[PDB]
Amino acid sequence: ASKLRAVLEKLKLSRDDISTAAGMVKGVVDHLLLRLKCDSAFRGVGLLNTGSYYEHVKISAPNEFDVMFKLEVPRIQLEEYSNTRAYYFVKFKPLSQFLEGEILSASKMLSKFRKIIKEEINDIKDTDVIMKRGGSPAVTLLISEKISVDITLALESKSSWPASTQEGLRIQNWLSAKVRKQLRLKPFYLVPKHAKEGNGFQEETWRLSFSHIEKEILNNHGKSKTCCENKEEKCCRKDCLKLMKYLLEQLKERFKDKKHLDKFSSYHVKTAFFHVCTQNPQDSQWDRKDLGLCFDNCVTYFLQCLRTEKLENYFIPEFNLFSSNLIDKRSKEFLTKQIEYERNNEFPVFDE
Ligand SMILES: Nc1nc(=O)c2ncn([C@@H]3O[C@@H]4COP(=O)(O)O[C@H]5[C@@H](O)[C@H](n6cnc7c(N)ncnc76)O[C@@H]5COP(=O)(O)O[C@@H]3[C@@H]4O)c2[nH]1
Numbered sequence: 001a002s003k004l005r006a007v008l009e010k011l012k013l014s015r016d017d018i019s020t021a022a023g024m025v026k027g028v029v030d031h032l033l034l035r036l037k038c039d040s041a042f043r044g045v046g047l048l049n050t051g052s053y054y055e056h057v058k059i060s061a062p063n064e065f066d067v068m069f070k071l072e073v074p075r076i077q078l079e080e081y082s083n084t085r086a087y088y089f090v091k092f093k094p095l096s097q098f099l100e101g102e103i104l105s106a107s108k109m110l111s112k113f114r115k116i117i118k119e120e121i122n123d124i125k126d127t128d129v130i131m132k133r134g135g136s137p138a139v140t141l142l143i144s145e146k147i148s149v150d151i152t153l154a155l156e157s158k159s160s161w162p163a164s165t166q167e168g169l170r171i172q173n174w175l176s177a178k179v180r181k182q183l184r185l186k187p188f189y190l191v192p193k194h195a196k197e198g199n200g201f202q203e204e205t206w207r208l209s210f211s212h213i214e215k216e217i218l219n220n221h222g223k224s225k226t227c228c229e230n231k232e233e234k235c236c237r238k239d240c241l242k243l244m245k246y247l248l249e250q251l252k253e254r255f256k257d258k259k260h261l262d263k264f265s266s267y268h269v270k271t272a273f274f275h276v277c278t279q280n281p282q283d284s285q286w287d288r289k290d291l292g293l294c295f296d297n298c299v300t301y302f303l304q305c306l307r308t309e310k311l312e313n314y315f316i317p318e319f320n321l322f323s324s325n326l327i328d329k330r331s332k333e334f335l336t337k338q339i340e341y342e343r344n345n346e347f348p349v350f351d352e
Protein backbone atom coordinates (compact mmCIF):
# COMPACT_ATOMS: atom_id res chain seq x y z
CA ALA A 1 0.00 0.00 0.00
CA SER A 2 2.75 2.46 0.89
CA LYS A 3 4.56 1.29 -2.26
CA LEU A 4 1.40 1.82 -4.32
CA ARG A 5 0.93 5.30 -2.85
CA ALA A 6 4.54 6.11 -3.76
CA VAL A 7 3.89 5.06 -7.36
CA LEU A 8 0.79 7.28 -7.43
CA GLU A 9 2.81 10.22 -6.05
CA LYS A 10 5.53 9.60 -8.64
CA LEU A 11 2.95 9.64 -11.45
CA LYS A 12 1.70 13.05 -10.30
CA LEU A 13 5.13 14.64 -10.94
CA SER A 14 4.33 14.51 -14.68
CA ARG A 15 1.03 16.38 -14.19
CA ASP A 16 2.22 19.56 -15.90
CA ASP A 17 4.13 17.60 -18.56
CA ILE A 18 0.92 15.89 -19.71
CA SER A 19 -0.94 19.20 -19.32
CA THR A 20 1.17 21.16 -21.80
CA ALA A 21 1.30 18.24 -24.26
CA ALA A 22 -2.50 18.03 -24.17
CA GLY A 23 -2.67 21.71 -25.11
CA MET A 24 -0.64 21.08 -28.26
CA VAL A 25 -3.00 18.24 -29.17
CA LYS A 26 -5.93 20.56 -28.43
CA GLY A 27 -4.83 23.40 -30.71
CA VAL A 28 -4.12 21.19 -33.71
CA VAL A 29 -7.51 19.48 -33.29
CA ASP A 30 -9.37 22.79 -33.53
CA HIS A 31 -7.70 23.76 -36.81
CA LEU A 32 -8.50 20.30 -38.16
CA LEU A 33 -12.14 20.69 -37.12
CA LEU A 34 -12.58 23.91 -39.10
CA ARG A 35 -11.12 22.50 -42.33
CA LEU A 36 -13.24 19.34 -42.11
CA LYS A 37 -16.38 21.44 -41.69
CA CYS A 38 -15.71 23.11 -45.06
CA ASP A 39 -16.19 19.74 -46.75
CA SER A 40 -19.80 18.89 -47.59
CA ALA A 41 -19.42 15.38 -46.19
CA PHE A 42 -18.01 16.52 -42.82
CA ARG A 43 -19.67 19.82 -42.00
CA GLY A 44 -21.74 18.33 -39.19
CA VAL A 45 -18.49 17.19 -37.58
CA GLY A 46 -17.61 18.04 -34.01
CA LEU A 47 -15.54 17.00 -31.04
CA LEU A 48 -16.84 14.16 -28.88
CA ASN A 49 -16.48 14.54 -25.09
CA THR A 50 -14.24 11.59 -24.09
CA GLY A 51 -11.13 12.88 -22.26
CA SER A 52 -9.84 14.62 -19.15
CA TYR A 53 -8.29 17.64 -20.91
CA TYR A 54 -10.78 20.26 -21.99
CA GLU A 55 -13.32 17.57 -22.80
CA HIS A 56 -11.95 16.04 -26.01
CA VAL A 57 -8.35 14.94 -25.36
CA LYS A 58 -8.03 11.51 -23.74
CA ILE A 59 -4.75 10.11 -22.39
CA SER A 60 -4.40 6.42 -23.25
CA ALA A 61 -0.72 6.30 -22.25
CA PRO A 62 2.14 8.76 -21.62
CA ASN A 63 2.27 10.88 -24.81
CA GLU A 64 -0.49 8.81 -26.47
CA PHE A 65 -3.52 11.05 -26.99
CA ASP A 66 -6.98 10.15 -28.24
CA VAL A 67 -9.54 12.40 -29.92
CA MET A 68 -12.87 11.43 -31.50
CA PHE A 69 -14.61 13.46 -34.21
CA LYS A 70 -18.35 12.78 -34.09
CA LEU A 71 -20.57 13.18 -37.16
CA GLU A 72 -24.33 13.55 -36.81
CA VAL A 73 -25.83 11.25 -39.43
CA PRO A 74 -29.46 10.98 -40.65
CA ARG A 75 -31.35 8.05 -39.10
CA ILE A 76 -29.25 4.92 -39.64
CA GLN A 77 -30.31 1.30 -40.03
CA LEU A 78 -27.79 -1.30 -38.85
CA GLU A 79 -27.01 -4.79 -40.16
CA GLU A 80 -24.92 -6.93 -37.83
CA TYR A 81 -21.91 -8.27 -39.71
CA SER A 82 -22.45 -12.04 -39.52
CA ASN A 83 -22.63 -12.80 -35.79
CA THR A 84 -19.74 -10.68 -34.47
CA ARG A 85 -22.06 -8.50 -32.30
CA ALA A 86 -19.69 -5.50 -32.40
CA TYR A 87 -19.35 -4.97 -36.18
CA TYR A 88 -22.11 -3.68 -38.44
CA PHE A 89 -22.95 -2.56 -41.93
CA VAL A 90 -24.46 0.93 -42.10
CA LYS A 91 -27.49 1.73 -44.28
CA PHE A 92 -29.81 4.72 -44.59
CA LYS A 93 -33.56 4.84 -43.96
CA PRO A 94 -24.58 14.28 -48.83
CA LEU A 95 -22.87 11.05 -47.67
CA SER A 96 -24.08 9.61 -50.98
CA GLN A 97 -20.51 9.71 -52.34
CA PHE A 98 -19.48 6.89 -49.95
CA LEU A 99 -22.28 4.42 -50.73
CA GLU A 100 -21.57 1.04 -52.35
CA GLY A 101 -25.07 -0.11 -53.18
CA GLU A 102 -26.99 0.72 -50.02
CA ILE A 103 -24.03 0.23 -47.65
CA LEU A 104 -22.05 3.20 -46.34
CA SER A 105 -18.42 2.36 -47.06
CA ALA A 106 -16.35 2.73 -43.91
CA SER A 107 -13.18 2.44 -45.98
CA LYS A 108 -14.30 5.16 -48.41
CA MET A 109 -15.43 7.53 -45.64
CA LEU A 110 -12.25 6.97 -43.65
CA SER A 111 -10.21 7.46 -46.84
CA LYS A 112 -11.48 11.01 -47.45
CA PHE A 113 -11.24 11.82 -43.73
CA ARG A 114 -7.61 10.67 -43.82
CA LYS A 115 -7.06 12.74 -46.98
CA ILE A 116 -8.42 16.04 -45.64
CA ILE A 117 -6.33 15.75 -42.48
CA LYS A 118 -3.23 15.00 -44.58
CA GLU A 119 -3.91 18.18 -46.55
CA GLU A 120 -4.07 20.32 -43.40
CA ILE A 121 -0.83 18.76 -42.13
CA ASN A 122 1.12 19.75 -45.25
CA ASP A 123 -0.28 23.29 -45.18
CA ILE A 124 0.64 24.12 -41.58
CA LYS A 125 4.03 25.77 -41.03
CA ASP A 126 3.39 26.26 -37.30
CA THR A 127 4.86 22.94 -36.14
CA ASP A 128 6.19 19.58 -37.36
CA VAL A 129 3.23 17.22 -37.77
CA ILE A 130 3.28 13.90 -39.63
CA MET A 131 1.02 10.91 -40.29
CA LYS A 132 1.34 7.21 -39.51
CA ARG A 133 -0.89 -0.34 -36.58
CA GLY A 134 -3.30 -2.06 -38.96
CA GLY A 135 -7.05 -2.32 -38.63
CA SER A 136 -7.37 0.84 -36.56
CA PRO A 137 -10.28 3.27 -37.06
CA ALA A 138 -7.89 6.07 -36.09
CA VAL A 139 -5.66 8.41 -38.08
CA THR A 140 -2.69 9.17 -35.86
CA LEU A 141 -0.54 12.32 -35.90
CA LEU A 142 2.88 12.95 -34.38
CA ILE A 143 3.39 16.47 -33.00
CA SER A 144 6.95 17.76 -32.43
CA GLU A 145 8.37 14.25 -33.01
CA LYS A 146 7.20 13.31 -29.49
CA ILE A 147 3.39 13.57 -29.05
CA SER A 148 1.14 10.96 -30.66
CA VAL A 149 -2.59 11.61 -31.15
CA ASP A 150 -5.12 9.17 -32.60
CA ILE A 151 -7.95 10.97 -34.40
CA THR A 152 -11.01 8.77 -34.89
CA LEU A 153 -14.05 9.50 -37.03
CA ALA A 154 -17.26 8.46 -35.26
CA LEU A 155 -20.73 8.29 -36.78
CA GLU A 156 -23.35 9.37 -34.24
CA SER A 157 -26.68 7.52 -34.05
CA LYS A 158 -29.44 8.82 -31.78
CA SER A 159 -31.61 5.69 -31.95
CA SER A 160 -31.88 2.82 -29.46
CA TRP A 161 -28.71 0.85 -28.87
CA PRO A 162 -28.32 -2.36 -30.89
CA ALA A 163 -29.52 -5.69 -29.53
CA SER A 164 -26.00 -6.96 -28.86
CA THR A 165 -25.84 -4.39 -26.02
CA GLN A 166 -29.07 -5.44 -24.28
CA GLU A 167 -27.26 -7.48 -21.60
CA GLY A 168 -24.23 -5.14 -21.39
CA LEU A 169 -23.51 -2.14 -19.17
CA ARG A 170 -24.39 -4.24 -16.10
CA ILE A 171 -24.29 -1.27 -13.73
CA GLN A 172 -27.73 -1.76 -12.13
CA ASN A 173 -26.41 -2.89 -8.73
CA TRP A 174 -23.62 -0.28 -8.70
CA LEU A 175 -24.71 2.95 -10.44
CA SER A 176 -28.48 1.98 -10.43
CA ALA A 177 -31.15 0.94 -12.91
CA LYS A 178 -32.18 4.60 -13.27
CA VAL A 179 -28.71 5.56 -14.43
CA ARG A 180 -28.45 2.60 -16.84
CA LYS A 181 -31.72 3.72 -18.47
CA GLN A 182 -30.47 7.31 -18.73
CA LEU A 183 -27.15 6.26 -20.25
CA ARG A 184 -28.84 3.97 -22.80
CA LEU A 185 -30.91 6.95 -24.01
CA LYS A 186 -27.74 8.73 -25.12
CA PRO A 187 -26.36 8.24 -28.65
CA PHE A 188 -23.98 5.48 -29.63
CA TYR A 189 -21.09 5.78 -32.06
CA LEU A 190 -19.72 3.77 -34.96
CA VAL A 191 -16.03 3.93 -35.81
CA PRO A 192 -14.54 2.65 -39.11
CA LYS A 193 -12.85 -0.32 -37.50
CA HIS A 194 -13.47 -3.30 -39.78
CA ALA A 195 -14.13 -6.86 -38.71
CA LYS A 196 -11.52 -9.32 -39.95
CA GLU A 197 -12.73 -11.08 -43.12
CA GLY A 198 -10.47 -14.12 -43.31
CA ASN A 199 -7.05 -12.65 -44.10
CA GLY A 200 -8.09 -9.03 -44.73
CA PHE A 201 -10.99 -6.83 -43.66
CA GLN A 202 -14.65 -6.32 -44.42
CA GLU A 203 -13.80 -2.77 -45.49
CA GLU A 204 -17.45 -1.66 -45.27
CA THR A 205 -18.00 -2.55 -41.59
CA TRP A 206 -18.08 -0.29 -38.54
CA ARG A 207 -17.65 -1.07 -34.85
CA LEU A 208 -19.74 0.21 -31.96
CA SER A 209 -18.06 2.68 -29.64
CA PHE A 210 -19.22 3.95 -26.25
CA SER A 211 -16.21 6.10 -25.33
CA HIS A 212 -18.53 8.86 -24.08
CA ILE A 213 -20.25 6.46 -21.67
CA GLU A 214 -16.88 5.15 -20.50
CA LYS A 215 -15.83 8.66 -19.51
CA GLU A 216 -19.11 9.29 -17.69
CA ILE A 217 -18.95 6.16 -15.56
CA LEU A 218 -15.30 6.82 -14.61
CA ASN A 219 -15.98 10.39 -13.53
CA ASN A 220 -19.36 9.71 -11.87
CA HIS A 221 -18.31 6.39 -10.44
CA GLY A 222 -19.75 5.94 -6.96
CA LYS A 223 -22.83 4.30 -5.57
CA SER A 224 -23.16 7.52 -3.58
CA LYS A 225 -23.86 10.53 -5.74
CA THR A 226 -21.34 12.40 -3.51
CA CYS A 227 -18.52 9.85 -3.90
CA CYS A 228 -15.23 11.81 -3.93
CA GLU A 229 -17.04 15.14 -3.31
CA ASN A 230 -16.04 15.30 0.37
CA LYS A 231 -13.42 14.01 2.79
CA GLU A 232 -15.77 11.38 4.22
CA GLU A 233 -16.28 9.73 0.80
CA LYS A 234 -12.84 9.37 -0.76
CA CYS A 235 -12.71 6.13 -2.75
CA CYS A 236 -9.72 4.63 -4.58
CA ARG A 237 -11.38 3.55 -7.85
CA LYS A 238 -9.54 5.99 -10.12
CA ASP A 239 -6.22 5.28 -8.38
CA CYS A 240 -6.72 1.55 -8.96
CA LEU A 241 -7.31 2.03 -12.67
CA LYS A 242 -4.20 4.25 -12.81
CA LEU A 243 -2.09 1.59 -11.10
CA MET A 244 -3.45 -1.13 -13.39
CA LYS A 245 -2.59 0.91 -16.49
CA TYR A 246 0.87 1.67 -15.08
CA LEU A 247 1.50 -1.99 -14.28
CA LEU A 248 0.77 -2.90 -17.91
CA GLU A 249 2.87 -0.02 -19.30
CA GLN A 250 5.82 -1.00 -17.12
CA LEU A 251 5.65 -4.68 -18.06
CA LYS A 252 5.43 -3.79 -21.76
CA GLU A 253 8.61 -1.73 -21.40
CA ARG A 254 10.42 -4.50 -19.50
CA PHE A 255 9.43 -7.07 -22.14
CA LYS A 256 10.27 -4.78 -25.06
CA ASP A 257 13.16 -6.98 -26.29
CA LYS A 258 10.77 -9.56 -27.81
CA LYS A 259 7.52 -7.54 -27.89
CA HIS A 260 5.51 -10.38 -26.31
CA LEU A 261 3.04 -7.91 -24.80
CA ASP A 262 2.38 -5.50 -27.62
CA LYS A 263 -1.19 -6.67 -28.33
CA PHE A 264 -2.24 -5.67 -24.81
CA SER A 265 -3.76 -2.25 -24.28
CA SER A 266 -4.94 0.20 -21.66
CA TYR A 267 -8.39 -0.53 -23.09
CA HIS A 268 -8.10 -4.11 -21.78
CA VAL A 269 -7.17 -2.88 -18.32
CA LYS A 270 -10.01 -0.33 -18.36
CA THR A 271 -12.57 -2.94 -19.40
CA ALA A 272 -11.43 -5.32 -16.66
CA PHE A 273 -11.63 -2.46 -14.16
CA PHE A 274 -15.27 -1.75 -15.08
CA HIS A 275 -16.05 -5.44 -14.48
CA VAL A 276 -14.51 -5.23 -11.01
CA CYS A 277 -16.67 -2.18 -10.29
CA THR A 278 -19.69 -4.32 -11.17
CA GLN A 279 -18.38 -7.10 -8.95
CA ASN A 280 -17.71 -4.65 -6.03
CA PRO A 281 -20.59 -2.16 -6.27
CA GLN A 282 -20.40 -0.58 -2.79
CA ASP A 283 -18.25 2.49 -2.11
CA SER A 284 -17.21 0.76 1.13
CA GLN A 285 -15.37 -1.76 -1.09
CA TRP A 286 -13.16 1.05 -2.46
CA ASP A 287 -12.18 2.90 0.70
CA ARG A 288 -8.98 4.87 0.16
CA LYS A 289 -7.43 3.23 3.21
CA ASP A 290 -7.84 -0.17 1.47
CA LEU A 291 -5.89 0.75 -1.71
CA GLY A 292 -3.64 -2.30 -1.48
CA LEU A 293 -6.58 -4.68 -1.25
CA CYS A 294 -8.60 -2.89 -3.93
CA PHE A 295 -5.65 -3.04 -6.34
CA ASP A 296 -5.24 -6.74 -5.58
CA ASN A 297 -8.94 -7.17 -6.44
CA CYS A 298 -8.25 -5.60 -9.82
CA VAL A 299 -5.11 -7.64 -10.48
CA THR A 300 -6.73 -10.94 -9.56
CA TYR A 301 -9.70 -10.37 -11.86
CA PHE A 302 -7.39 -9.37 -14.71
CA LEU A 303 -5.35 -12.53 -14.08
CA GLN A 304 -8.54 -14.59 -14.25
CA CYS A 305 -9.46 -12.96 -17.57
CA LEU A 306 -6.04 -13.89 -18.93
CA ARG A 307 -6.14 -17.50 -17.67
CA THR A 308 -9.64 -18.09 -19.07
CA GLU A 309 -8.93 -16.12 -22.27
CA LYS A 310 -12.11 -14.13 -21.71
CA LEU A 311 -12.45 -10.37 -21.29
CA GLU A 312 -15.96 -9.26 -22.25
CA ASN A 313 -16.47 -5.88 -23.82
CA TYR A 314 -18.32 -4.00 -21.09
CA PHE A 315 -21.13 -2.91 -23.43
CA ILE A 316 -21.20 -5.93 -25.74
CA PRO A 317 -20.91 -9.07 -23.58
CA GLU A 318 -20.54 -11.52 -26.46
CA PHE A 319 -17.55 -9.64 -27.90
CA ASN A 320 -14.51 -11.26 -26.26
CA LEU A 321 -11.48 -8.93 -26.30
CA PHE A 322 -9.25 -11.89 -25.30
CA SER A 323 -10.48 -14.28 -27.98
CA SER A 324 -7.83 -16.24 -29.88
CA ASN A 325 -8.97 -14.35 -32.99
CA LEU A 326 -7.54 -11.15 -31.47
CA ILE A 327 -4.73 -12.21 -29.11
CA ASP A 328 -2.82 -15.45 -29.50
CA LYS A 329 -2.89 -18.05 -26.73
CA ARG A 330 0.87 -17.79 -26.20
CA SER A 331 0.73 -14.06 -25.46
CA LYS A 332 -2.05 -14.41 -22.86
CA GLU A 333 -0.20 -17.25 -21.15
CA PHE A 334 2.94 -15.10 -21.16
CA LEU A 335 1.24 -12.13 -19.48
CA THR A 336 -0.47 -14.41 -16.94
CA LYS A 337 2.91 -15.73 -15.76
CA GLN A 338 4.35 -12.23 -15.30
CA ILE A 339 1.36 -10.77 -13.49
CA GLU A 340 1.28 -13.86 -11.28
CA TYR A 341 4.95 -13.33 -10.45
CA GLU A 342 4.36 -9.63 -9.75
CA ARG A 343 1.36 -10.24 -7.50
CA ASN A 344 3.13 -13.07 -5.63
CA ASN A 345 6.13 -10.83 -4.89
CA GLU A 346 4.52 -7.48 -3.88
CA PHE A 347 5.02 -5.98 -7.39
CA PRO A 348 8.80 -5.68 -7.84
CA VAL A 349 8.12 -3.78 -11.09
CA PHE A 350 7.06 -0.91 -8.80
CA ASP A 351 10.35 -0.96 -6.85
CA GLU A 352 12.50 2.16 -6.43
N1 LIG B 1 -7.91 5.43 -30.81
C1 LIG B 1 -8.61 4.15 -31.04
N2 LIG B 1 -10.01 4.02 -30.87
C2 LIG B 1 -10.71 2.77 -31.09
O1 LIG B 1 -11.91 2.72 -30.91
C3 LIG B 1 -9.90 1.56 -31.53
N3 LIG B 1 -10.20 0.27 -31.83
C4 LIG B 1 -9.05 -0.36 -32.18
N4 LIG B 1 -8.07 0.56 -32.07
C5 LIG B 1 -6.76 0.05 -32.45
O2 LIG B 1 -6.90 -0.64 -33.75
C6 LIG B 1 -5.99 -1.80 -33.66
C7 LIG B 1 -6.75 -3.03 -33.72
O3 LIG B 1 -7.19 -3.42 -32.36
P1 LIG B 1 -8.64 -4.31 -32.43
O4 LIG B 1 -9.74 -3.41 -32.95
O5 LIG B 1 -8.60 -5.51 -33.33
O6 LIG B 1 -8.90 -4.59 -30.76
C8 LIG B 1 -9.03 -3.34 -29.98
C9 LIG B 1 -10.46 -2.97 -29.75
O7 LIG B 1 -11.36 -4.10 -29.85
C10 LIG B 1 -10.54 -2.48 -28.34
N5 LIG B 1 -10.71 -1.04 -28.26
C11 LIG B 1 -9.74 -0.12 -28.21
N6 LIG B 1 -10.38 1.08 -28.12
C12 LIG B 1 -11.72 0.86 -28.09
C13 LIG B 1 -12.78 1.69 -27.99
N7 LIG B 1 -12.63 3.16 -27.89
N8 LIG B 1 -14.03 1.20 -27.99
C14 LIG B 1 -14.24 -0.13 -28.08
N9 LIG B 1 -13.17 -0.97 -28.18
C15 LIG B 1 -11.93 -0.47 -28.18
O8 LIG B 1 -9.30 -2.80 -27.70
C16 LIG B 1 -8.49 -3.57 -28.68
C17 LIG B 1 -7.01 -3.13 -28.60
O9 LIG B 1 -6.95 -1.71 -28.74
P2 LIG B 1 -5.43 -0.89 -29.01
O10 LIG B 1 -4.40 -1.92 -29.12
O11 LIG B 1 -5.01 -0.04 -27.89
O12 LIG B 1 -5.39 -0.04 -30.53
C18 LIG B 1 -6.16 -0.82 -31.50
C19 LIG B 1 -5.26 -1.62 -32.34
O13 LIG B 1 -4.10 -0.88 -32.60
C20 LIG B 1 -8.56 1.71 -31.70
N10 LIG B 1 -7.84 3.00 -31.46
Ligand SMILES: [Zn+2]
Nearest residue numbers: 222227228235
Ligand atom coordinates in the same frame (compact mmCIF):
# COMPACT_ATOMS: atom_id res chain seq x y z
ZN1 LIG C 1 -15.13 8.03 -5.51
